[PDB]
Amino acid sequence: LEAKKEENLADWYSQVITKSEMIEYHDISGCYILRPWAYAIWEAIKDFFDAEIKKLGVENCYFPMFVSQSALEKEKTHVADFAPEVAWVTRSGKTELAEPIAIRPTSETVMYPAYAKWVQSHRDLPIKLNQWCNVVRWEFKHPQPFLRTREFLWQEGHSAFATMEEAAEEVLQILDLYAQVYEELLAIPVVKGRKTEKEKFAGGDYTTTIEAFISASGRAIQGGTSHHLGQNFSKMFEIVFEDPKIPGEKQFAYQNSWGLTTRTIGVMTMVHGDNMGLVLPPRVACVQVVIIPCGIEDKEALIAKCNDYRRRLLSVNIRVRADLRDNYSPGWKFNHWELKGVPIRLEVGPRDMKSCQFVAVRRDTGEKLTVAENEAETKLQAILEDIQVTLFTRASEDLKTHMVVANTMEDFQKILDSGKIVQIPFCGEIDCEDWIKKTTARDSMGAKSLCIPFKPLCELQPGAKCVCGKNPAKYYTLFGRSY
Amino acid sequence: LEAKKEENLADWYSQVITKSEMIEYHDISGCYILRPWAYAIWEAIKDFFDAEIKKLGVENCYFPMFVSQSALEKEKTHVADFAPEVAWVTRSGKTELAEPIAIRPTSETVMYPAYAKWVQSHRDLPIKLNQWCNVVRWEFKHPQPFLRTREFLWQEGHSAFATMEEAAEEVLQILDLYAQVYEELLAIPVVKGRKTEKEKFAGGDYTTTIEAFISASGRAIQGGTSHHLGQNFSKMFEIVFEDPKIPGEKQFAYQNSWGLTTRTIGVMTMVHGDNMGLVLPPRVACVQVVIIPCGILSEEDKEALIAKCNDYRRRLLSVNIRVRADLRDNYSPGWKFNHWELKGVPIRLEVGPRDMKSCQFVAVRRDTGEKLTVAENEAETKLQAILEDIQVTLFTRASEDLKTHMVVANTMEDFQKILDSGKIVQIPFCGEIDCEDWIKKTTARMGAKSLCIPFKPLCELQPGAKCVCGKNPAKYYTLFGRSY
Numbered sequence A: 001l002e003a004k005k006e007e008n009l010a011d012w013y014s015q016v017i018t019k020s021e022m023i024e025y026h027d028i029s030g031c032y033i034l035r036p037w038a039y040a041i042w043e044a045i046k047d048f049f050d051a052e053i054k055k056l057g058v059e060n061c062y063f064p065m066f067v068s069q070s071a072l073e074k075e076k077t078h079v080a081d082f083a084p085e086v087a088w089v090t091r092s093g094k095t096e097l098a099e100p101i102a103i104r105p106t107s108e109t110v111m112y113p114a115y116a117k118w119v120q121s122h123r124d125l126p127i128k129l130n131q132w133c134n135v136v137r138w139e140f141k142h143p144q145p146f147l148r149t150r151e152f153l154w155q156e157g158h159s160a161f162a163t164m165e166e167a168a169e170e171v172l173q174i175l176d177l178y179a180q181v182y183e184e185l186l187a188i189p190v191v192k193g194r195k196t197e198k199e200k201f202a203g204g205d206y207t208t209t210i211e212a213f214i215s216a217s218g219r220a221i222q223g224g225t226s227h228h229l230g231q232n233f234s235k236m237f238e239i240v241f242e243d244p245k246i247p248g249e250k251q252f253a254y255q256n257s258w259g260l261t262t263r264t265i266g267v268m269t270m271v272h273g274d275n276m277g278l279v280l281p282p283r284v285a286c287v288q289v290v291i292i293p294c295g296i297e298d299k300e301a302l303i304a305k306c307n308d309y310r311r312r313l314l315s316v317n318i319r320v321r322a323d324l325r326d327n328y329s330p331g332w333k334f335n336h337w338e339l340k341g342v343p344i345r346l347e348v349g350p351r352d353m354k355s356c357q358f359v360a361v362r363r364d365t366g367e368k369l370t371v372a373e374n375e376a377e378t379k380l381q382a383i384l385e386d387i388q389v390t391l392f393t394r395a396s397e398d399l400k401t402h403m404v405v406a407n408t409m410e411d412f413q414k415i416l417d418s419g420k421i422v423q424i425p426f427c428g429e430i431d432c433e434d435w436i437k438k439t440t441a442r443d444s445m446g447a448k449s450l451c452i453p454f455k456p457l458c459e460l461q462p463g464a465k466c467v468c469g470k471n472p473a474k475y476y477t478l479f480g481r482s483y
Numbered sequence B: 001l002e003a004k005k006e007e008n009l010a011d012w013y014s015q016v017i018t019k020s021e022m023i024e025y026h027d028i029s030g031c032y033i034l035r036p037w038a039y040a041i042w043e044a045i046k047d048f049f050d051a052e053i054k055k056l057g058v059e060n061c062y063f064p065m066f067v068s069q070s071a072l073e074k075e076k077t078h079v080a081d082f083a084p085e086v087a088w089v090t091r092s093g094k095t096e097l098a099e100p101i102a103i104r105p106t107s108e109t110v111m112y113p114a115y116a117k118w119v120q121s122h123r124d125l126p127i128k129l130n131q132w133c134n135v136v137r138w139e140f141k142h143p144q145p146f147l148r149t150r151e152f153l154w155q156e157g158h159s160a161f162a163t164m165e166e167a168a169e170e171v172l173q174i175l176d177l178y179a180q181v182y183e184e185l186l187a188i189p190v191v192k193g194r195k196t197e198k199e200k201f202a203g204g205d206y207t208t209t210i211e212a213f214i215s216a217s218g219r220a221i222q223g224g225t226s227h228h229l230g231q232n233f234s235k236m237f238e239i240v241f242e243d244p245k246i247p248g249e250k251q252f253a254y255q256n257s258w259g260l261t262t263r264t265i266g267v268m269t270m271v272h273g274d275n276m277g278l279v280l281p282p283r284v285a286c287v288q289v290v291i292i293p294c295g296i297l298s299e300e301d302k303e304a305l306i307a308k309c310n311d312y313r314r315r316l317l318s319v320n321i322r323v324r325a326d327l328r329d330n331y332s333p334g335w336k337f338n339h340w341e342l343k344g345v346p347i348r349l350e351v352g353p354r355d356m357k358s359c360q361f362v363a364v365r366r367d368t369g370e371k372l373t374v375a376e377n378e379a380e381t382k383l384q385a386i387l388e389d390i391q392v393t394l395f396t397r398a399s400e401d402l403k404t405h406m407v408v409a410n411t412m413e414d415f416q417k418i419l420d421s422g423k424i425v426q427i428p429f430c431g432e433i434d435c436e437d438w439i440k441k442t443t444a445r446m447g448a449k450s451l452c453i454p455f456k457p458l459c460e461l462q463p464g465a466k467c468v469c470g471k472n473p474a475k476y477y478t479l480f481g482r483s484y
């Protein structure tokens, strides 16, 4: 690893993801290979989120990836803000197809015709379906592994309800699960808020989101989305149910949709990584503890003690690997598993082995702890938990010191250009948000809105005006440069 | 269910997969929706197979779905066979791309360029990667859900080895796992064999496969394949490693690939499905036991009735018997009886007021329909024994139908006659591609194709035996018959 994070973040990020064996590059621009080390992190996210939504009654399924040309021309609002982001398949080999079919940028147009057929009575509600699949979102920006990719893995849940009350409560419930994925699994603090009318999901009623901050570049990034679609989609696809008491009365269902992608892994890398490579939170680390024989007569004695620790950690269900390979130097193994971000390195040397003790090296801080043999299960469990909270507390210390309030325009400008995100009084108008992005690049890149936070840092002053100095302010809005 | 299995099988198949809430149709032909009832079966197959390949050192990953045209044409024999069924992306919205890119029909040409970068030394081998993903093969033949789809889910494992012995060993290991999936999980007997030169994976060395038989249609179907690719792909993508003992020497890696698709669910539906609907083998049954309260006057005693269903729901979970208590008060019990019958739940547990007073209940088997009156005492043990008896009964019934419609034929006179009986035949075959085309041509005057060259044939081919054509010597018994 040659590049430094605080200097050239782009070169550092490329070396960290590749030398840790997370990502390989593909011949198709914007497409990246998810190697096992990174795929296991997605599986840890998948295992947590799947078990949580099944408590809410959500069931897993799989819908086709192709969208017909007629189905996309259904909702006029959903097709406009998505057509340039859709790749079309027009031929099979040397034979043109009947009609050009589209690769899914999202599965609203695929599932909701089926929802209309499944929903006829009030007993058929609520429908709660989820799928883990890939999605092709063609775009024109600069692709980045995990962060901005033309193909990415995600889950997308789509729920239909008989009332808007229950639909509104699922939006926040799923958004809170997304917050737990970032805060409790990846040790990343997020800000929960609402998207502005300019950046909300097209055709939906409102979009909620979680925003994470990357202090290495001073830019924020959207971590997830939970949309309330209202009856907009159910009216165009005719998702209607019969009234359970009023004979013959039919009502359009209230729908939601929510997604979480593999950019979680990229935000984990950007926030926690250092100049020695990746840093994995123990909650999602494929290997939490790596056992390395040091000082490698009684050679079989040292190897069997490594196997004793390996099985003792498996009994308390700690993900452990014993690198017993004789082809590489111990110092080589030290650097190999540090680049890969293993939270704890367990070193067993001949002297320590005969003393019934070992050395545990913390990946986050580099601290070396000498631990006795009998305390291996309890101590290593305590260090792993201490690593998880340390990563979260240090990440939140960056968020608290890089998100502040500004009530005028150029103080919002002055704080922004120092690598921060700012909450400002905003009128919420779309034409005003265009001027903000143009002025932020005028007086780099132009700052766009991130979210209208639920719990802002400060409450709005009575009668406070927007930063544009032309319309009254509706709410504090978190602005800043974004990926 | 409208149609019946013995009559219009295609109509029966559509009814059973939709009324069981497995498949919903899409407005694009060949593409189908995997509803949660069908997806749970795929998840059960995934959990078994994934754990088995982890023991062999295989690791999960995910490669991109797009293929460049330069990488696709790196192996000429491989691209020549998949070319007509490759879906090509040619436009981004309303703008035509300068160079079109392809949707993967398979991931050999996607992964092996990455294998070349990862393999430099002998320590880099073996590589054993697997991915659970979707794939697109645009077959213009009349599609059918699960059996013949344009897009389907599968797993594909790709392994590279330093030697041929270990590579050849993995081929038979993965093949036996595919056999376990059909026989142990889905209760479907299969025949292990090698595909002919005409039907093997183009570009590979040899293809092993498992062939199942559908007695309702008399046709056989390929249930999965495990290919030995040899060095044909490593030579084209330059997957080379330095010799561990000879300085400067490099050798090409020996590669394998193996895939199992959602066709498994279709075969399970075709083999075990009856006129009452789907029939799930208890090994992959999302719900093995469904509790339905039946007998609805006294609201005070009905309160203890739902408590009895929850009582059975709780203690059945102690032995981890997947049990669901259908306690919905917005549907008739008779509606729930036929609803869970269509879905194929192996056992229906009916709770009645009189049965509660007599300290008894009634268990209904899905495969046989035998309504058996059991007691509260042996509720956990006998429902466990009935589940295992259902799995064996389904497998025995499908094995007897296979052992009945798979016979040996030493003459085209016998081969075409027993082919009209809705059967499959093992005949002495020379293995020539031109002869396999002649066999397919003369059996339509509905043409029969080659299925597999069985490892354990019905009879042994002794020297002096000629092929069914008569122009060349026969080298092995080959299972023929009409296929999907």
Ligand code: PRO
Pocket (backbone or CB within 6 Å): A105, A106, A107, A108, A155, A156, A157, A201, A225, A227, A257, A258, A259, A260
């Ligand atoms: O694309 C989106 O943002 C929503 C959420 C997942 C499904 N559609």
Ligand code: PRO
Pocket (backbone or CB within 6 Å): B105, B106, B107, B108, B155, B156, B157, B201, B225, B227, B257, B258, B259, B260
């Ligand atoms: O398509 C096939 O049949 C082989 C096996 C899985 C990957 N490629």
Ligand SMILES: [Sr+2]
Pocket (backbone or CB within 6 Å): A057, A058, A059, A128
């Ligand atoms: Sr549900």
Ligand SMILES: [Sr+2]
Pocket (backbone or CB within 6 Å): A249, A250
């Ligand atoms: Sr009305």
Ligand SMILES: [Sr+2]
Pocket (backbone or CB within 6 Å): A249, A250, A251
């Ligand atoms: Sr109404």
Ligand SMILES: [Sr+2]
Pocket (backbone or CB within 6 Å): B057, B058, B059, B128
């Ligand atoms: Sr491995």
Ligand SMILES: [Sr+2]
Pocket (backbone or CB within 6 Å): B249, B250
């Ligand atoms: Sr040589």
Ligand SMILES: [Sr+2]
Pocket (backbone or CB within 6 Å): B249, B250, B251
């Ligand atoms: Sr050589």
Ligand SMILES: [Zn+2]
Pocket (backbone or CB within 6 Å): A426, A427, A428, A429, A432, A466, A467, A468, A469, A470, A471
């Ligand atoms: Zn304004």
Ligand SMILES: [Zn+2]
Pocket (backbone or CB within 6 Å): B429, B430, B431, B432, B435, B467, B468, B469, B470, B471, B472
């Ligand atoms: Zn012949």
